[PDB]
Amino acid sequence: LHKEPATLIKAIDGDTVKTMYKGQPMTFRLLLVDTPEFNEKYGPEASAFTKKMVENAKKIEVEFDKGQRTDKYGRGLAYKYADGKMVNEALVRQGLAKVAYVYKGNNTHEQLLRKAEAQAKKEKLNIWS
Numbered sequence: 001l002h003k004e005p006a007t008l009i010k011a012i013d014g015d016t017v018k019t020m021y022k023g024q025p026m027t028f029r030l031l032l033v034d035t036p037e038f039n040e041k042y043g044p045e046a047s048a049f050t051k052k053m054v055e056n057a058k059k060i061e062v063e064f065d066k067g068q069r070t071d072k073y074g075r076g077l078a079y080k081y082a083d084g085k086m087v088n089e090a091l092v093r094q095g096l097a098k099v100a101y102v103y104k105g106n107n108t109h110e111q112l113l114r115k116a117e118a119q120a121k122k123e124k125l126n127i128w129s
């Protein structure tokens with residue numbers, strides 16, 4: 001896989017962000033994770049974590065997997081990076097997302113994320129507390 005440029009338009013919630021990609025606005029849903037909804041426990045903390053991470057970044061990048069690049073809602077499906085740090089992994093490592101929605105052929109970073117989740121579980125962080 002490879003990273004491509006994107007520029008933040010707006011933080012949305014823990015696992016969705018609006019970014020401009022090849023000059024067009026899109027809403028991206030982060031691959032391989034599930035944050036709580038804003039109305040659910042930790043939902044606001046996940047939203048604020050992702051928002052801080054993308055708003056503070058000097059450089060956002062998007063990385064598509066090998067499979068489907070959009071979902072049925074027309075959202076982009078990608079791994080997102082903020083100054084080189086994967087947002088999807090960072091959420092999981094902080095116990096603010098579960099590994100979820102692991103579909104065959106768009107699961108290149110699964111094992112990296114499962115290892116973050118195990119570590120967040122060991123530390124009993126947030127969702128795992």
Ligand SMILES: Cc1cn([C@H]2C[C@H](OP(=O)(O)O)[C@@H](COP(=O)(O)O)O2)c(=O)[nH]c1=O
Binds near residue numbers: 031034
């Ligand atoms: C992350 C992800 C979500 N989705 C779809 C499955 C879920 O469908 P349903 O809407 O029918 O439940 C929905 C969950 O997204 P949210 O967790 O953003 O609600 O997005 C994909 O199809 N592919 C993906 O890789």
Ligand SMILES: [Ca+2]
Binds near residue numbers: 015034035036037
């Ligand atoms: Ca969600």
